Design an enzyme around this catalytic site. Structure first.
Site, PDB file in Angstrom:
ATOM      1  CE  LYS A 127     -12.389  -2.578  10.059  1.00  0.00           C
ATOM      2  NZ  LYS A 127     -12.553  -1.386  10.918  1.00  0.00           N
ATOM      3  CG  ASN A 128      -8.715  -4.774   7.966  1.00  0.00           C
ATOM      4  OD1 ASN A 128      -9.572  -3.931   7.710  1.00  0.00           O
ATOM      5  ND2 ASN A 128      -7.854  -4.633   8.956  1.00  0.00           N
ATOM      6  CB  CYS A 165      -6.520  16.014  -7.524  1.00  0.00           C
ATOM      7  SG  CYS A 165      -8.144  15.719  -8.253  1.00  0.00           S
ATOM      8  NE  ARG A 213       2.186  14.438  -2.251  1.00  0.00           N
ATOM      9  CZ  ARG A 213       3.070  15.330  -1.814  1.00  0.00           C
ATOM     10  NH1 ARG A 213       2.697  16.259  -0.939  1.00  0.00           N
ATOM     11  NH2 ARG A 213       4.318  15.317  -2.276  1.00  0.00           N
ATOM     12  CG  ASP A 243      -2.214  -4.816  13.211  1.00  0.00           C
ATOM     13  OD1 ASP A 243      -1.958  -3.607  13.404  1.00  0.00           O
ATOM     14  OD2 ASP A 243      -2.531  -5.270  12.092  1.00  0.00           O
ATOM     15  NE  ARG A 249     -14.527   5.208  14.599  1.00  0.00           N
ATOM     16  CZ  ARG A 249     -13.929   6.384  14.423  1.00  0.00           C
ATOM     17  NH1 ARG A 249     -12.640   6.433  14.112  1.00  0.00           N
ATOM     18  NH2 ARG A 249     -14.628   7.511  14.541  1.00  0.00           N
TER      19      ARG A 249
HETATM   20  O1  LIG Z   1      -0.963   3.826  -2.629  1.00  0.00           O
HETATM   21  C1  LIG Z   1      -0.229   3.615  -1.679  1.00  0.00           C
HETATM   22  C2  LIG Z   1      -0.580   2.595  -0.707  1.00  0.00           C
HETATM   23  C3  LIG Z   1       0.328   2.412   0.375  1.00  0.00           C
HETATM   24  N1  LIG Z   1       1.548   3.217   0.485  1.00  0.00           N
HETATM   25  C4  LIG Z   1       2.498   3.017   1.648  1.00  0.00           C
HETATM   26  O2  LIG Z   1       2.880   1.646   1.756  1.00  0.00           O
HETATM   27  C5  LIG Z   1       2.516   1.095   3.028  1.00  0.00           C
HETATM   28  C6  LIG Z   1       1.570   0.023   2.656  1.00  0.00           C
HETATM   29  O3  LIG Z   1       0.240   0.235   2.947  1.00  0.00           O
HETATM   30  P1  LIG Z   1      -0.764  -0.884   3.281  1.00  0.00           P
HETATM   31  O4  LIG Z   1      -0.102  -2.239   3.285  1.00  0.00           O
HETATM   32  O5  LIG Z   1      -1.927  -0.956   2.273  1.00  0.00           O
HETATM   33  O6  LIG Z   1      -1.117  -0.697   4.799  1.00  0.00           O
HETATM   34  P2  LIG Z   1      -2.512  -0.625   5.462  1.00  0.00           P
HETATM   35  O7  LIG Z   1      -3.597  -0.847   4.404  1.00  0.00           O
HETATM   36  O8  LIG Z   1      -2.774   0.741   6.155  1.00  0.00           O
HETATM   37  O9  LIG Z   1      -2.561  -1.809   6.528  1.00  0.00           O
HETATM   38  C7  LIG Z   1      -2.281  -3.158   6.165  1.00  0.00           C
HETATM   39  O10 LIG Z   1      -0.885  -3.211   5.739  1.00  0.00           O
HETATM   40  C8  LIG Z   1       0.149  -2.905   6.856  1.00  0.00           C
HETATM   41  C9  LIG Z   1       1.472  -2.966   6.309  1.00  0.00           C
HETATM   42  O11 LIG Z   1       1.749  -2.010   5.387  1.00  0.00           O
HETATM   43  C10 LIG Z   1      -0.050  -3.878   8.057  1.00  0.00           C
HETATM   44  O12 LIG Z   1       0.866  -3.539   9.144  1.00  0.00           O
HETATM   45  C11 LIG Z   1      -1.460  -3.794   8.546  1.00  0.00           C
HETATM   46  O13 LIG Z   1      -1.600  -4.714   9.684  1.00  0.00           O
HETATM   47  C12 LIG Z   1      -2.450  -4.146   7.416  1.00  0.00           C
HETATM   48  O14 LIG Z   1      -3.825  -4.067   7.809  1.00  0.00           O
HETATM   49  C13 LIG Z   1       1.876   2.235   3.762  1.00  0.00           C
HETATM   50  O15 LIG Z   1       2.595   2.448   4.987  1.00  0.00           O
HETATM   51  C14 LIG Z   1       1.874   3.405   2.926  1.00  0.00           C
HETATM   52  O16 LIG Z   1       2.581   4.494   3.477  1.00  0.00           O
HETATM   53  C15 LIG Z   1       1.832   4.189  -0.491  1.00  0.00           C
HETATM   54  O17 LIG Z   1       2.846   4.896  -0.443  1.00  0.00           O
HETATM   55  N2  LIG Z   1       0.956   4.380  -1.550  1.00  0.00           N
END
Ligand SMILES: O=c1ccn([C@@H]2O[C@H](COP(=O)(O)OP(=O)(O)O[C@H]3O[C@H](CO)[C@@H](O)[C@H](O)[C@H]3O)[C@@H](O)[C@H]2O)c(=O)[nH]1
EC number: 2.5.1.7
Length: 419
Positions: A22-23, A115, A120, A305, A397
């Site tokens: 899915k991802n 916003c 954020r 995961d 899901r």
């Molecule tokens: O605009 C943003 C996007 C992300 N983050 C932070 O950076 C981390 C990174 O996010 P992201 O990598 O995109 O996480 P997810 O999309 O929710 O999940 C994917 O990325 C994780 C690691 O961050 C993995 O553990 C998951 O398995 C994978 O599906 C997060 O914890 C957020 O808190 C921000 O502060 N601002």
């Protein structure tokens, strides 16, 4: 409220065909907004988020249709706003921003909560686009992006490793004027898949899967056919299913290289594992698993995961094994449920100390987390008697017909309608 009624114990064995991730499907569907020509995305799972994405795409002017594949024709995209009504249930919605501004010079996405609140969680996305030369506006409950002409290639250094922001920047950069470098890019196989998709369309990208992605912007992206990679976590869940039940299983439509750490760990638990180009076999030889020490860490290290699944493994293994979450926090909330099933374990700091027992006892259990939940279903399968796992919608899901798959493996399982 759907429930899974499980009758154990039952050995899980045989074959299962792994669904597309899915991802990987999600960021690819969004990247399809870049394609000038028709595109066929193969091996796309039938899941809620996919439906939401299809509806979002259609609203933009995209022609969409699905089965195993999703057929996309974005030659006609002419509406550059992802509205509240269509984005609300989905974070991935932000992925529409980059492609729109990259190809059309303009785009906007509704920010639930408004916003101040909604901006954020997507700051990195905004940062990336800014780096690419876009003007970002936070107004009227939207995040808006625009640029005069093409985006501009940039040297982008990520302070936080983010799968979401990496996809946004990489996708947008494919149409930018010049070279873009993303330092500290997310390494996920899903990132590799999205980059490969982009390249299939005519993009110039290298370094995907490493800490540094280099993109050379081109004028336009075409169309074509692309197959989404296999769900690595679904694969791990099935491997564990056999590993905790003395079974033998062959995973079809798999990709072994996305699972290095998991396979290594399974080997430590005593599993006999074999791999081929697109399959993985696991054989316990009727033996109980051996307890293992697990440290979750960033890819390609052991995936967080897979934690709940291995915690379960430890709970029915020979010996004591400790699972440590090196990065994540408060990840053991499901353990009390397992204890109710006769498990022995202690939660300490960022770890769980597992004392394996020979057999679990059926109970009425529930977990909020998708992974924790599927783990409960596996536990029921091997426990003594009847288990009832509540709130399985969580599982629905992210798992494509897990009940059918489990049954074909010998599970005694039934979907019950509101108990
Ligand atoms: O605009 C943003 C996007 C992300 N983050 C932070 O950076 C981390 C990174 O996010 P992201 O990598 O995109 O996480 P997810 O999309 O929710 O999940 C994917 O990325 C994780 C690691 O961050 C993995 O553990 C998951 O398995 C994978 O599906 C997060 O914890 C957020 O808190 C921000 O502060 N601002």
């Amino acid at each position: 409220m759907d429930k899974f009624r499980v009758q154990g114990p039952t050995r899980l064995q045989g074959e299962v065909t792994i669904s597309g991730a899915k991802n990987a499907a999600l960021p690819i569907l969004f990247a399809a907004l870049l394609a000038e020509e028709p595109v066929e995305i193969q091996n796309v799972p039938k899941l809620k988020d996919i439906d939401t994405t299809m509806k979002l795409l259609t609203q933009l002017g995209t022609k969409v249709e699905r089965x195993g594949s999703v057929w996309i024709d974005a030659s006609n995209v002419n509406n550059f706003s992802a509205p509240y009504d269509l984005v609300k249930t989905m974070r991935a919605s932000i992925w529409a921003l980059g492609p729109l501004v990259a190809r059309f010079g303009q785009g906007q996405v509704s920010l639930p909560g408004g916003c101040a609140i909604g901006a954020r969680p997507v700051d990195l996305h905004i940062f990336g686009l800014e780096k690419l030369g876009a003007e970002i506006k936070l107004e009227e409950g939207y995040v808006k992006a625009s640029v005069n002409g093409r985006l501009k290639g940039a040297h982008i250094v990520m302070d936080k490793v983010s799968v979401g922001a990496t996809v946004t920047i990489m996708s947008a950069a494919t149409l930018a004027e010049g070279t873009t470098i993303i330092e500290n890019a997310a390494r996920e196989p899903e990132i590799v898949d999205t980059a490969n998709f982009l390249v299939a369309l005519g993009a110039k990208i290298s370094g995907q899967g490493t800490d540094r992605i280099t993109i050379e912007g081109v004028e336009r992206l075409g169309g074509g056919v692309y197959r989404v990679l296999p769900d690595r976590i679904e694969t791990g869940t099935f491997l564990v299913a056999a590993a905790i039940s003395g079974g033998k299983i062959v995973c079809r439509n798999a990709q072994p290289d996305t699972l290095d750490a998991v396979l290594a760990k399974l080997r430590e638990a005593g599993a006999d594992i074999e791999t081929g180009e697109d399959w993985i076999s696991l054989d316990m030889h009727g033996k109980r698993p051996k307890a293992v020490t697990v440290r979750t860490a960033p890819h390609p290290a052991f995936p967080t995961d897979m934690q709940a699944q291995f915690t379960l493994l430890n709970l029915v293994a020979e010996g004591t094994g400790v699972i440590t979450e090196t990065i994540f926090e408060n990840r053991f909330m499901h353990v009390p449920e397992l204890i109710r099933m006769g498990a022995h374990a202690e939660i300490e700091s960022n770890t769980v100390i597992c004392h394996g027992v020979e057999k679990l006892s059926g109970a009425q259990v529930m977990a909020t987390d998708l992974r924790a939940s599927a783990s409960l279903v596996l536990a029921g399968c091997i426990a003594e008697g009847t288990t009832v796992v509540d709130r399985i919608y969580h599982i629905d899901r992210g798992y494509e017909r897990i009940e059918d798959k489990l049954r074909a493996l010998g599970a005694n399982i039934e979907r019950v309608k509101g108990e």
